[PDB]
Every structure is written in structure tokens, then in C-alpha cells.
């Protein structure tokens, strides 16, 4: 991804967009009960904690475009992945407007909580004023589609979340590029059934994990994997994607029956954004806008890994590459050992910056003991080995419980953390509950005990 130009929105006919400048994150009742070092990400250039230009820092993710066209290794990757998806017999017909709005099997309804994007954000009109879940009315939407059309600018928001001290000082805040409601709706009508098929088929055929339930999915993953695991992290995955990867994605779509609307991918590839009082054009780079976003990033990840394996290991048997991606995150395998360091080297030529799995200093062998997916380790249950626990380290949970975005959601927030934490074992879990109950807010919460969660887990299979 590369920003082509940036200038005052007024100069191109667009209004200034208002964006909050104060985080909703504040110390929780457990701020001093647990250890943590993360704090709210910088949201404005005037933040006292800054140690460098904010604007420059947030847009520095657009490192450029390393490639222009789709080479032969990419075309082969496209053929192999498309052929694989062909086995799913994905319904290729457009999804009706109602279902695209209020959902259907395999696709949840539009989030009435998120931004409606342009021009609604500037007209003060909100999703709640357009959508009606009780009636599933499409009249208001349809009228809005006819009026403002599609391919509208994406509204950029700084993401209000916790970040390390270094990232705060370096102004490395992540961005949200919200597509207009018109585009989200249009995109879901065009690819709704594709999204549904992926959501319903997490695994090594879709090569995707979007819509998965870790508590149940972890027990299924080991079986789908080949003998030798391999993995790596990406630095700024979304923004680093070159236009060629979007073209390769369109080829896949064309081959599986959606050649009909590959034009929608162009909107993601060559896109224009609104940020505050500025507008800019980006060539390449996946906008972080929705579940559609994550599915396409996942499909591209499948194309990337296949491409690097073909370029690095001529004669590789892609039919034995077993991988599952969630956006840029991935867990992969092959019958033979591969060199992640080599793959990373080939990756640079395709515009991808690949580093050792889980922040390792060097590229080390990935095993069932040290591998992580969605920040979770894999651990066989002590009593029933065939049941696999998704284990997220307590460190992350501790960091999260120390802050709140709304005192009214304390119960939900803490329960959600408990569902993640108990997998660390009964001893650790009880210590967690005892600390929570060391303050009045914690004592008033209705939280599940260990045996209750374990029984609930067994009963969910
Ligand atoms: Na883009």
C-alpha cells in the first residue's frame, strides 16, 4: 500500500469529519490488583505522551508496493487455491438485500453499533435510523442506495485500544477504515454467500478460521495438520499488500463463480479515505473495515504462502500444504520441514515483511508445544487427551481487566475474560477469581467457578 496524495478535503468537495479525541478507556476497579504496562493509544497529535509526529506515525504503515503484476508462481497459487475452494460448492448467487442487512445462516446481521461511514457520519444520520431488526425493513436502505450510490470514501478513525508504552510514544496507533453503510451492504449482497460458506467451514479447505469457536475448534485443528508445522508473523500485513495481490484475489473469485463482481475488489485496492479535514488516495493496502475484510485478507494469505512455497521450493506438493489463516495470523504445516527464514526472504520480494513466529529473535522450529494461533497455545486436557484446550496466557487477560470502557459492562467484560482464563488450569483460575474478589466491584460479580466451566466445556462437544 502507498498513499498517492493527501490534501484538504474541502479541495476535493468533502466535509471535515469529526472524530473523538478522548479515550473511553479508564482504570478499572482492578487496576491495582493486577500487573500491566499497557495504556490507551494516542488518539490526537496533541497527546502529551507523544515523542514524534503523530500523522507521520499512523500513516507510516503504508510501506509501498513491491510488485506490479501477478507472476507465474502467483498464478499457480491462484489455480491451486481456487481448485480447492471449488470442492465446497459455494452458492455463487447474490444475496438478497434483506439477508445482507439482517443476516442469515452463516452471516450475522450488520452491527448497529459501528459507524455508518460517509455521508451519514456527516449528516448526523445513524444506522438505528435506517435499520429495523424487528421488521427487517429494507425500504429505507434501498432508498439510500439509490440516492448516494456506492464506492463512497472510507472514514478513518483511530482505534481506541490499549497499546505498549513504546507504541504510545511512537504514535503507533492502529486505524479503522470504515466503509460506508452503502458499500458494506452492496459488498454483502455480492459476496454474502461466500462469507457464509467460509463462516460455516473453518478449516484447511477454506484455509480460514473466521467465525470459529476456539473452545471447540482447537480439538479439530491438530487432526487437519500435516506432520511438520511452520509459521511466522507479518509486520503491517494489511497495509503492505500490493495491488498484484488484489488482482490474484480477483482471479480466484472469477474461477469460483464470482467473476461477476470482482469490481468490488478494486474499491478495496485503489481506495480513497477521509481523515479529519483531509482526504487521501491509497494504491494497494487492505482497508480494515469488516468481516469481509478479514475473509479477503485470509484468502490472500492462502495465496501468499502458496506463492512463497512455489518460488522457494520448486516441486512442492501444495495438496499437502495444510494451513488455516485468520487475516494475517496463520498456522500451517507440510509433510516435510521448511525454512521460515528462507520463506521470509522470498517474501520481501513480494512486498511482505515476515518475522519469527511470536516475536522470537530467530526463526525456530514450530512445535505443538510452542505454536500459537489467535494468541492461544494448544494443550491436551489432562483427563481427556483428545479434548484440546485453547490457552491464552494470563498476561493478556491481566492487561485487559485493568481498564474499562463502561462501568455498566463490567460483568460482561470480566465474564468474557473468565472464559479465556480458566483454560490455564484450576490453580491459576482460582487465583484469578480470588484477586477479583479482593475488591467490592469484584465481590458483586456473578462469575463461574472452575468445575462449572469444565463441565460446560465437556457438555459443549
Ligand atoms: Na487500498
UniProtKB/Swiss-Prot annotation:
Its cofactor is Mg(2+). Mg(2+) 2 binds at residues 233, 328. Binds 2 magnesium ions that constitute a dinuclear catalytic metal center. The magnesium ions are not prebound but only present for catalysis. Requires the presence of 3CDpro or 3CPro. Signal peptide: none annotated. Disulfide bonds: none annotated. Residues 1-461 are cytoplasmic. It is a peripheral membrane protein. It catalyses: RNA(n) + a ribonucleoside 5'-triphosphate = RNA(n+1) + diphosphate. Replication or transcription is subject to high level of random mutations by the nucleotide analog ribavirin. It is found in: Host cytoplasmic vesicle membrane. Residues 227-342 form the RdRp catalytic domain. Mg(2+) 1 binds at residues 233, 328. Replicates the viral genomic RNA on the surface of intracellular membranes. May form linear arrays of subunits that propagate along a strong head-to-tail interaction called interface-I. Covalently attaches UMP to a tyrosine of VPg, which is used to prime RNA synthesis. The positive stranded RNA genome is first replicated at virus induced membranous vesicles, creating a dsRNA genomic replication form. This dsRNA is then used as template to synthesize positive stranded RNA genomes. ss(+)RNA genomes are either translated, replicated or encapsidated. Interacts with Viral protein genome-linked and with protein 3CD. This is RNA-directed RNA polymerase.
